[PDB]
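Protocol check, entry for the methods section draft. Step 1: assemble the input record (protein sequence plus ligand SMILES). Step 2: submit for complex structure prediction. Step 3: store the structure tokens unaltered in the notebook. Ligand used here: sinefungin. Step 1 record:
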Amino acid sequence: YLEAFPKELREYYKNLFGKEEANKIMKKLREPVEHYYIRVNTLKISREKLIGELKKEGLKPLRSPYLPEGLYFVREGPNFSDDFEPKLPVVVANKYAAESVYQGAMLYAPGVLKADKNIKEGDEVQIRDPKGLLVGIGIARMDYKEMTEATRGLAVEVTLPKFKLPSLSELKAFEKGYFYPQGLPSMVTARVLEPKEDDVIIDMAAAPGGKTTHIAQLLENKGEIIAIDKSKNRLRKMEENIKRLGVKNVKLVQMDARKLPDLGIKADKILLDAPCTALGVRPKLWEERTLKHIEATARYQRAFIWAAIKSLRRGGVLVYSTCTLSYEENEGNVKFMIRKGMKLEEQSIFIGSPGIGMNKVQRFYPHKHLTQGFFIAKLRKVKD
Ligand SMILES: Nc1ncnc2c1ncn2[C@@H]1O[C@H](C[C@@H](N)CC[C@H](N)C(=O)O)[C@@H](O)[C@H]1O
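Step 3, stored output:
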């Protein structure tokens, strides 16, 4: 599994976590989350009602004892050994299709990069990513020719994915806005913000609106949430999420969030779920980002942070979060915040790990908490 991570990043992890822990993290990082979480949209439905609805579809949701809005599914797999060499013709899926197949998705024709020419419908085939990673085994539903030419349709019915997560996008319950897929650390993030109906609230990197709509339901569609993103398409997707979830609480604004103080707003609560190297996301088939990205991105996040601090009322609260493992983007950038008049505060929910040489910030690790790698800092602005 180590091959999935560039050598200098591996040295970095060993340095930052210790050889043993670093190895446990990387190994788990290559696998999908063991507990696949969704958020109950309490704007439309209760947890127990939704559970009943999901059981109807043959799904087995489990309750979180920490998040009354939390449900999760237990991951299946691995369904074959890491060294398994099936005696089967190969279908090569592109980088994106391979990752979804890795978690139980079917392989559709546009996802097919190339294939063995002997393949006919009904043949058993193995599916590999462009680097030879075996991600699944299944039955071809197209001949070789149609597979490499079709613009739509089923190419391989994946009957033996390496891992299996439930597909929730096609459920009636999803179309009716009953839930929103979202990791446990992400849900904790919104709770720890403790949004109030009175608070002036800003999500300055909000699309596609996962944490924003979570705040919305905690506010019970009262108050107002200002949600900022630079991307119009991602804001376009966020508009759809809002409508589906029945969120009436949110004001969208397109802009570079680093220029946030250009508004005349002094917020009481700011969520900064900052763009990051995403070193913690799962599954991690191949890590492309490395040390140069950590420094550049960390420096890039500071602009957001500074913008937020200047836009906070004194006594105001900032919650900073990333889906990355690096020190620089996390604890290092919090030290930055501490030098700029911010004070660390106890978070209301703490089920993860302590930070690196740092007490009140919260980390999540895939090997310890069955989640993506994650980081949460909650700060109070004591002075300007
Ligand atoms: N300078 C920027 N200004 C505003 N938004 C940005 C900027 N750079 C990146 N973003 C957005 O930051 C977001 C990063 C997302 N991963 C955040 C997801 C969000 N927290 C959610 O709960 O769904 C993307 O939507 C980016 O479009």
